[PDB]
């Protein structure tokens, strides 16, 4: 039902999933003291975090994650737990085992489907009528640890890689009270069960299309492709570059 | 689904807002179909600003009763107002542009609680529930027809600052019904009960008063805790009931 007083909640986290976890911990009863976030440095999807950081005289580093800086932040906070929102390192698992409790992820997919990064797209690329997303507990690789909640968001066939990315922000967050709790109380959730999918760092497909794909696949790529400010996807035609409309 | 071309002007400020539009680009509204009337960017409302500006949507910042604002509104040509924290009286007139009308997230259980300081008056009265509504905005502040509420606990240990972020965290997840109500056409269910307002003002100059009961203390010290502003005063700062008793 509720959080155990004195909970210590580290949060490491980046732009509005962030602020909304710092909402809802405080929502929670969480002392604002007992509250630690690790971030990356204020850019324009970061400033709503920062600026309540500062506002409420939260706790916080930039430091970079393999730093000793940001261990030494860590350490002196003594966390119980940590939660990971979108933060955008790798975290190194020495910090992890700062808290007692284990930690949390937010990854926008069914794991083990979709390990890797871009999941949002890759889904829409393959034609997925169904994804999800999952909290998990982090162990010392990305998006491999026990699974504490998923649940299912159907992909629909207007979605665009940014319209699906916004979902998967808004509908996580229902669920992040109950996670949270999940974690206070010692849930040790389930191994990942299925078989994984991995995909590559970068953009897919270097956001060109390939005039050999089928026109499906072509509707599915640039859909994938539709992240605003960013340029859509590419067709080249006599060695040249023309954005698509989409 | 929402309607197709859907088009949806947000008049609002901070995180709900920030959210809001996150919630409409999940359902499929896209960016030239979102507008957004809000204030200056602050320290509350950077996050949305920063939005605005990565996406490109279009806003303004204008005076709700100015004539940039109007035109503002008038120029997108909204289906459905949302009204997520603004804070200011939106005009009719401006109002009556949107043909399916209007929603606003007010913080408490309406018509009770109408006004401002809603969840430190909560906490102060020593309310054990409160909760929130999303209602369809008429010319006036708080009194339009209800689409949507739910009850929030209030805790013995809730601050007004708790309390004013599980409102927050707790309305988010409700949006989405309340902007696929609107866009259906409910209705909603005009208010019933007693209505009571409460101002701006600071209650009691957050001076705790030695004659009342250590339940009462403790309500007043909880509903002037909301970092960064001073927390209670005794005739000195009193953020915890522990640190009152000591002080006596
Ligand atoms: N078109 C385009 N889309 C992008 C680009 N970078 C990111 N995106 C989209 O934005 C989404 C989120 O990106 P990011 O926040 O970096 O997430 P992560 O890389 O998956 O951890 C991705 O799933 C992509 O769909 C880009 O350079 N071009
Ligand atoms: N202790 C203290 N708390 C404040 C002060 N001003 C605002 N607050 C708290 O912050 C909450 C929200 O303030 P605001 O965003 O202005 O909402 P409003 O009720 O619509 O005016 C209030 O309900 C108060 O609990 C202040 O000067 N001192
Ligand atoms: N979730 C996830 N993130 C990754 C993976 N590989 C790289 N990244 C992150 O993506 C960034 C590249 O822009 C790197 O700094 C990593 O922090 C992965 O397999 N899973």
């Avoid at 491999?144 to 992909?155: H, K, M």
């Amino acid at each position: 039902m509720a959080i155990a007083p004195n909970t210590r909640v580290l949060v490491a986290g980046y732009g509005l999933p962030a602020e909304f976890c710092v909402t809802t911990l405080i929502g929670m009863g969480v002392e604002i003291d007992k509250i630690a976030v690790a971030t990356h440095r204020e850019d324009n999807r970061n400033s709503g975090l920062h600026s309540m950081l500062r506002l409420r005289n939260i706790q916080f580093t930039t430091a970079a994650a393999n730093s000793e800086e940001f261990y030494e932040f860590g350490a002196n906070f003594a966390p119980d737990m940590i939660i990971s929102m979108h933060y955008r390192s790798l975290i190194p698992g020495r910090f992890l085992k700062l808290a007692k409790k284990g930690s949390v992820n937010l990854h926008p997919s069914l794991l083990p489907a979709y390990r890797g990064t871009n999941s949002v797209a890759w889904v829409i690329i393959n034609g997925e009528s169904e994804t999800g997303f999952s909290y998990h507990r982090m162990d010392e690789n990305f998006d491999t640890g026990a699974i504490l909640l998923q649940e299912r968001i159907s992909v629909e066939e207007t979605d665009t890689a940014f319209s699906l990315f916004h979902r998967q922000i808004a509908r996580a967050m229902l669920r992040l009270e109950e996670v949270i709790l999940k974690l206070d109380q010692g849930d040790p959730g389930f191994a990942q069960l299925g078989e994984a999918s991995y995909y590559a760092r970068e953009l897919p497909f270097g956001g060109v299309i390939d005039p050999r794909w089928s026109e499906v696949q072509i509707d599915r790529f640039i859909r994938a492709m539709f992240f605003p400010p960013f340029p859509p996807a590419v067709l080249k035609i006599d060695g040249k570059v023309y954005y698509v409309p989409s």
